[PDB]
Amino acid sequence: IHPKNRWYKAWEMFILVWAIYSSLFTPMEFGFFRGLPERLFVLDIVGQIAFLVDIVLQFFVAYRDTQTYRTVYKPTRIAFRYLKSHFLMDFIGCFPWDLIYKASGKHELVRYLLWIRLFRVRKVVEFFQRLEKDTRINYLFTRILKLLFVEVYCTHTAACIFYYLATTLPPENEGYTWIGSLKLGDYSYENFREIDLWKRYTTALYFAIVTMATVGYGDIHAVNLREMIFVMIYVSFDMVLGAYLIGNITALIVKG
Amino acid sequence: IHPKNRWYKAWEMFILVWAIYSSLFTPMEFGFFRGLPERLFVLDIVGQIAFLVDIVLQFFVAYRDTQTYRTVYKPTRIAFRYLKSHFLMDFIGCFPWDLIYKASGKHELVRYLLWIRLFRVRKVVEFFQRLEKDTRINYLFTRILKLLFVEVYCTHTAACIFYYLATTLPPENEGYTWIGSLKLGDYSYENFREIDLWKRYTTALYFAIVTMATVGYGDIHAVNLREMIFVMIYVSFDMVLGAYLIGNITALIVKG
Amino acid sequence: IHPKNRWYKAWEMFILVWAIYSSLFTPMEFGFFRGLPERLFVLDIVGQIAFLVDIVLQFFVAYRDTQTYRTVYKPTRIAFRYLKSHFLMDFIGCFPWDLIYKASGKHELVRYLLWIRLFRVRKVVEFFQRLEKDTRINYLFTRILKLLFVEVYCTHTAACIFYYLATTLPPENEGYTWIGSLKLGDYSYENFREIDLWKRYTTALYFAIVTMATVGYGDIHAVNLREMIFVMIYVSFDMVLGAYLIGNITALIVKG
Amino acid sequence: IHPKNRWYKAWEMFILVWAIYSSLFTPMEFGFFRGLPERLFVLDIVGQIAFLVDIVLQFFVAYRDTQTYRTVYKPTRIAFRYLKSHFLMDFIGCFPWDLIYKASGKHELVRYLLWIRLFRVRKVVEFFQRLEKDTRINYLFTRILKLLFVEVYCTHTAACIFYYLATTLPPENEGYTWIGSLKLGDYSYENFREIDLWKRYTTALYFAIVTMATVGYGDIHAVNLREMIFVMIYVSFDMVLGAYLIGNITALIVKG
Ligand SMILES: [K+]
Ligand SMILES: [K+]
Known part of the structure; x- marks a missing residue:
C-alpha cells in the first residue's frame, strides 16, 4: 500500500x-x-x-x-x-x-x-x-532525545539483568549476592525470591539509576564475580553514553 | 501606570x-x-x-x-x-x-x-x-546564572521533600526511613521528629547537595520504596540539569 | 628600577x-x-x-x-x-x-x-x-593550567580546614567527628590529635581529592553540623570549578 | 627494506x-x-x-x-x-x-x-x-579512540599496582589493607594471597573501573597510607583524562 x-x-x-x-x-x-x-x-x-x-x-x-x-x-x-x-x-x-x-x-x-x-x-x-x-524539529534535539531514551532504556534492561544474576546462584547460597545480603534500615532481603515483584524491581532499578547517573551511594553493590564483571561492563558503556549525551547537548547550545 | x-x-x-x-x-x-x-x-x-x-x-x-x-x-x-x-x-x-x-x-x-x-x-x-x-551582561551568562539558581533551588526543594517522605510513615515504623535509621559517629537520629529544626534541615540538605553534585558519599541513602522512587526521579533530572549547565558554560567559553 | x-x-x-x-x-x-x-x-x-x-x-x-x-x-x-x-x-x-x-x-x-x-x-x-x-603559549592552555592549579590548591586548603573543623570540638566529644570516628581496616583513629602529622594530613587530603574529583567513596564523611555545612559549601564550588575546567578544555579542543 | x-x-x-x-x-x-x-x-x-x-x-x-x-x-x-x-x-x-x-x-x-x-x-x-x-577515518575519531584505549589501559595497570600495594605489607599485618580487610556478602578475603588469581584480578579491577568512571561505590577503598597516596594520584589523572575525552567527543559532535 x-x-x-x-x-x-x-x-x-x-x-x-x-x-x-x-x-x-x-x-x-x-x-x-x-x-x-x-x-x-x-x-x-x-x-x-x-x-x-x-x-x-x-x-x-x-x-x-x-x-x-x-x-x-x-x-x-x-x-x-x-x-x-x-x-x-x-x-x-x-x-x-x-x-x-x-x-x-x-x-x-x-x-x-x-x-x-x-x-x-x-x-x-x-x-x-x-x-x-520532520523539519519541525532540529537535527540535534532529535539526537539528544534519542540518546536520553537509549540511556534510560539501557538502565532498565541493566537493572533487569542485575536482578537476574542474583537468581543464577542456588537459593542456599543467597547471602553471597547483591540482593539477599542487602540490609536497608531494619528490613533484610533474606528470601528475596519471595518478596513482592515491585519491591524487587524498584530495588534493582535504584542501583541502576544511581550508577547510570554516576552517583553510586554504595548501599547496593556487586558481591560476586558475575555481578562485578557485569558492573564493570555496565559502567564502561554508560560512561561513553553520558559523554555522548553531554557532547550533543553542548553542540546544541553552541550552534544556537 | x-x-x-x-x-x-x-x-x-x-x-x-x-x-x-x-x-x-x-x-x-x-x-x-x-x-x-x-x-x-x-x-x-x-x-x-x-x-x-x-x-x-x-x-x-x-x-x-x-x-x-x-x-x-x-x-x-x-x-x-x-x-x-x-x-x-x-x-x-x-x-x-x-x-x-x-x-x-x-x-x-x-x-x-x-x-x-x-x-x-x-x-x-x-x-x-x-x-x-540588558546589554550590560551577555546572552549566555544570564543562562548560566539562571541554570545555577534553578539547580540550587531544586536542591533545597528536593531536600525538603526528602525529609517529608520520612514523616509519612508512622512514628513506630521509624527505623525504616532515610533518617531515624541514621547513625553518624556516636549520634543516633532516633526520634528525628523531636530534634532541632536546623539539625534536620542541614542533614536533609547534605544529602541533596551530595547528590546534586553527584558525589554520593553513601552515609545517607534511601531505605524505603517511596524514598527510592524519589531518589531515582531526582537524579534523572539533576543529571539533565547538570548537562545543560556544563553545555552552557562550554558555549560561553567557546564564543568568548 | x-x-x-x-x-x-x-x-x-x-x-x-x-x-x-x-x-x-x-x-x-x-x-x-x-x-x-x-x-x-x-x-x-x-x-x-x-x-x-x-x-x-x-x-x-x-x-x-x-x-x-x-x-x-x-x-x-x-x-x-x-x-x-x-x-x-x-x-x-x-x-x-x-x-x-x-x-x-x-x-x-x-x-x-x-x-x-x-x-x-x-x-x-x-x-x-x-x-x-608570552606568545610561546596559547590563550586557552594558560587558562586550563591556571584552573587546574586553582582546583588542586583549593583542594589542599579545603583538606586543611576540614581537619581543623575536627579540632573545634573538645577532645572528650571526639567520637562525634569525621576523624576520631574513623575506622579504616583494623586501625582506629582514636586519639587523632596524637597521631603523626603526615598520617593526619594524608587522611584529610584523601577526603578532599575523592570529592574534588567527585568520587566520594564514603569511607570518610562529615558527621557534625559544621562539617556538613562545610562539605556542602566545598562541593557547590568544586562543581563550578570542574565545569569551568571541562569547558575550557573543550574550547581548546574545538578551537584547535 | x-x-x-x-x-x-x-x-x-x-x-x-x-x-x-x-x-x-x-x-x-x-x-x-x-x-x-x-x-x-x-x-x-x-x-x-x-x-x-x-x-x-x-x-x-x-x-x-x-x-x-x-x-x-x-x-x-x-x-x-x-x-x-x-x-x-x-x-x-x-x-x-x-x-x-x-x-x-x-x-x-x-x-x-x-x-x-x-x-x-x-x-x-x-x-x-x-x-x-589514513583518510578513511577522521582526525577526531582517532583521538577519541586513542583516549578511550589509554583510559582503559591505565585503569588495568592501576588495578595491578593497587593489588601490588597490598603485598608490600607483611602477611601478618594483612587486616590493615584494602584487600584482606574486605568483607563482601558472606565471603571474607582473609588469606588474599591464597585465593584464585582471577578472583583477585576481578576484585582489583572492579575498584579501578568504579573510580575511572567516578562511581565510587565505597565497598572497596584505600586503608593504608600507600593506598591513599596512590588513589589520590590515580584520581587526579583520571579526571584530566576524562575531561580530555569529553572535550574530544564534544569537538567531534560540534565539528559536524
Ligand atoms: K560519585
Ligand atoms: K559511596
Whole structure:
C-alpha cells in the first residue's frame, strides 16, 4: 500500500505502542519473572498475534527505493527487501517462547532467548528517525532525545539483568549476592525470591539509576564475580553514553 | 501606570525579595514544619497581604502589547490580560492555607496544596529575563546564572521533600526511613521528629547537595520504596540539569 | 628600577618560590599545627624577612602606566600605586602572627588571621599572567593550567580546614567527628590529635581529592553540623570549578 | 627494506598483537604474580625472542627521512636513527627479567624493573597514528579512540599496582589493607594471597573501573597510607583524562 496511507500511520503508531511495551517488558520477563504466571498468558497471545499481523502488513506494503527517487510498487521486489532486511529475526522473535520453555522440560537455554524480542526497538528508532526528518524539529534535539531514551532504556534492561544474576546462584547460597545480603534500615532481603515483584524491581532499578547517573551511594553493590564483571561492563558503556549525551547537548547550545 | 514608573522598580524589587522568601520557605513549611508554630503567625499574614497588594497593583498597571510595539493604556484589555495569563493561580496561592488546614480537622490534603505558592518563582525568572534584556551582561551568562539558581533551588526543594517522605510513615515504623535509621559517629537520629529544626534541615540538605553534585558519599541513602522512587526521579533530572549547565558554560567559553 | 632588569627576574622567581611555600604551608599551619613547634621558628623568621625585603624592593621599583604606554620613573606616583593597591594587605600578613598568638595568652582569634597570608598567591596569579602574555603559549592552555592549579590548591586548603573543623570540638566529644570516628581496616583513629602529622594530613587530603574529583567513596564523611555545612559549601564550588575546567578544555579542543 | 613491503605490514600487525599481550600482561606479572609459575616459562622466552627478532628487523629496515620527502636507503644512517631513537630501552626491556630475579637471590629491586617493558605500547600508538593519517577515518575519531584505549589501559595497570600495594605489607599485618580487610556478602578475603588469581584480578579491577568512571561505590577503598597516596594520584589523572575525552567527543559532535 502507499506509504502515505492515513490509516497506515495509525497502524504504525499502534505498533509503536506495542513495541514500547514489548521492549520494556521483555527484560523483566527474562529477569524477575521465571515462567510467567497464568494471568499474563492472554497478554502474550495478544502481543504475538499483533506482531504477526504487523509482519503480514509489512509483507503487504509498498516502499521507496533508496538508490534513486522511485516509489516502487512491484510485490516481488518488496518481498525480497523484507526477506533480506530483518524479516527472519522478527519472525524468530515472534513464536511464543515462554510456552516452549514451559513445555520442553523447563530448560533455561530456551528462556535465554526471548532476548531476541529486543529487535522490536527498531520501531522506536524508526520513529526517532521520522521525527528527525520532520523539519519541525532540529537535527540535534532529535539526537539528544534519542540518546536520553537509549540511556534510560539501557538502565532498565541493566537493572533487569542485575536482578537476574542474583537468581543464577542456588537459593542456599543467597547471602553471597547483591540482593539477599542487602540490609536497608531494619528490613533484610533474606528470601528475596519471595518478596513482592515491585519491591524487587524498584530495588534493582535504584542501583541502576544511581550508577547510570554516576552517583553510586554504595548501599547496593556487586558481591560476586558475575555481578562485578557485569558492573564493570555496565559502567564502561554508560560512561561513553553520558559523554555522548553531554557532547550533543553542548553542540546544541553552541550552534544556537 | 507607565512601566517606566521609577517607584514601580522599587515595588518590583521589593516583591522580588518577598518572592525569594516565599519560594525558599514554602517547601520548608510543607516539609519540616507541620502546622506552623504560633510564633510565625504574623509572617504568613504579612506575606499574604503583601502579595494581595501586588495582585491589585498588577490589576491597576499598564502593560506593553506583544503583537507590535504599542505601550497600551486602556484598562479593559489590561484586565483581560491579567485574568487569562496567571491571575487565578496566584490568587489561589494567596489564601492563608495553614489556617484552613488547622481549622478543617487537620486534613493532610489541605496541607498538600501550599505547593501552589511555588508560582511566585515567576518573579525570579522575570528578573532573570529582564537582566537578559540588558546589554550590560551577555546572552549566555544570564543562562548560566539562571541554570545555577534553578539547580540550587531544586536542591533545597528536593531536600525538603526528602525529609517529608520520612514523616509519612508512622512514628513506630521509624527505623525504616532515610533518617531515624541514621547513625553518624556516636549520634543516633532516633526520634528525628523531636530534634532541632536546623539539625534536620542541614542533614536533609547534605544529602541533596551530595547528590546534586553527584558525589554520593553513601552515609545517607534511601531505605524505603517511596524514598527510592524519589531518589531515582531526582537524579534523572539533576543529571539533565547538570548537562545543560556544563553545555552552557562550554558555549560561553567557546564564543568568548 | 627598570622592569626589564635581568636580576629582577631572578628576584621575581625567588619570590614566586617563597610564595608557593607560604601559600601551601599557611593553611597547614592554621590547621594541623597549633602553635608551631620551636623547630620551624627560623623558617618563620626567614619567610617574614624575605617578604619584607620584597616589600621594600617593590617600593623601590618602577612600573608601566596602564592608561597609556608610559614607563613612568617618577618615585611619588610609583609609590602611590602600591600604597593604594595592596600595601596594607601584604604588610598585615607580614608580621609574625604565630608569635603574637603565643604571647597574648594563646587567643584563638589571633590564630584565626594568618589566613591573610593567602594574598601571596597573587604572585602565582601574576606569573600565570606573564606566561599568558608570552606568545610561546596559547590563550586557552594558560587558562586550563591556571584552573587546574586553582582546583588542586583549593583542594589542599579545603583538606586543611576540614581537619581543623575536627579540632573545634573538645577532645572528650571526639567520637562525634569525621576523624576520631574513623575506622579504616583494623586501625582506629582514636586519639587523632596524637597521631603523626603526615598520617593526619594524608587522611584529610584523601577526603578532599575523592570529592574534588567527585568520587566520594564514603569511607570518610562529615558527621557534625559544621562539617556538613562545610562539605556542602566545598562541593557547590568544586562543581563550578570542574565545569569551568571541562569547558575550557573543550574550547581548546574545538578551537584547535 | 622498502616500508611498503607487503609482508612488512603482516609483520607489523603480528608485532602489534605481541605488543598488546606484553603491555596487558606486564603489569599483571609485576603485580598479582610474584616469580611466575613454571607453567608460563615458555611464553616469556617466545615473547623475548620475538621482540629481539623485531629489533634486528628494525636494524635491517629502510625508513623515511623527516626533514624532507626522501625515502633514504643507506644502512649507516638507519642504524644511527635506530640507536639515537628508542632502541636501548627496547633491548633493556628484552632481557628475561624474571630469570634474573629468580637467580639473583629473589631481590625485589630486580622485579621492580619489568615495568620497562611498557615501552612496547609504542607500537599501539604507532598504529593509532597510522590510522590517523589514513583518510578513511577522521582526525577526531582517532583521538577519541586513542583516549578511550589509554583510559582503559591505565585503569588495568592501576588495578595491578593497587593489588601490588597490598603485598608490600607483611602477611601478618594483612587486616590493615584494602584487600584482606574486605568483607563482601558472606565471603571474607582473609588469606588474599591464597585465593584464585582471577578472583583477585576481578576484585582489583572492579575498584579501578568504579573510580575511572567516578562511581565510587565505597565497598572497596584505600586503608593504608600507600593506598591513599596512590588513589589520590590515580584520581587526579583520571579526571584530566576524562575531561580530555569529553572535550574530544564534544569537538567531534560540534565539528559536524
Ligand atoms: K560519585
Ligand atoms: K559511596
